[PDB]
Design a protein around this ligand. Sequence first.
Ligand SMILES: NS(=O)(=O)c1ccc(Nc2nc(OCC3CCCCC3)c3nc[nH]c3n2)cc1
Length: 271
Amino acid sequence: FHKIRNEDLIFNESLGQGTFTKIFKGVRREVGDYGQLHETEVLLKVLDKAHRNYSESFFEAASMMSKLSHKHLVLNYGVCVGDENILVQEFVKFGSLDTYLKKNKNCINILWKLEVAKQLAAAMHFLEENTLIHGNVCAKNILLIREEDRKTGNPPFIKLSDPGISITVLPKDILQERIPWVPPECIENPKNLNLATDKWSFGTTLWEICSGGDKPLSALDSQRKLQFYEDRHQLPAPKAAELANLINNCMDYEPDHRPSFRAIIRDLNSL
Ligand SMILES: NS(=O)(=O)c1ccc(Nc2nc(OCC3CCCCC3)c3nc[nH]c3n2)cc1
């Protein structure tokens, strides 16, 4: 990981929090191409001091995104390691997709959703061909690089962000709170993290995209989410149910039966 000096980073407004992290918008001063000095907007993820013992995992997540280069994967600029574990990533202009769906719900049609789903499925297919597990696919980890422009025909463009601290080391209560993004076999055993995990979570993310930013099973507490998995329930079809069958096919309780992302892309194109 490229090391960035603390002196070259300026922390600005807080954007929110992740699991054991605080997120800030900021600015990196750098020497760019041709030796020109640049002031670049950056996203700064700060691991909580109280959870410093997660540092390794906290960085390993980011590491998984930087071992491969792809147009749909977020760029990591580097790491700043005083008493702070700081990850420096690219700043995406329009933020995460859950909030965007919530705010622009009344003007998102099936074509926009289909384009976003195809791009996410392409990123996940790239990961699958490389046998690289993401482990936390959700709308909050999808970032909107640019908006759809029907005046020029430009589609929206999205990127997948890093998964954050892995579910293989997170406390059990946080894992149960993450139902139904966390597949049943990982609730049974978090070490069952596998490529099929991402297919299940991709189905859940499609539910999110079709539900205008609503969170599935948010009305259920952790015990009731556990029991939801115990009774082998499926998520209800969204009011916009164009992708409901694909959602249910991806969220198969048998991990070996979840369709490959090539078949998922074939379904999306068939629609
Ligand atoms: N709604 S908003 O207008 O205030 C706005 C917000 C965030 C961003 N940019 C942005 N966000 C990320 O996480 C998105 C998320 C992080 C914390 C909770 C809020 C947003 C990124 N992850 C890598 N790069 C990222 N860039 C642009 C605009």
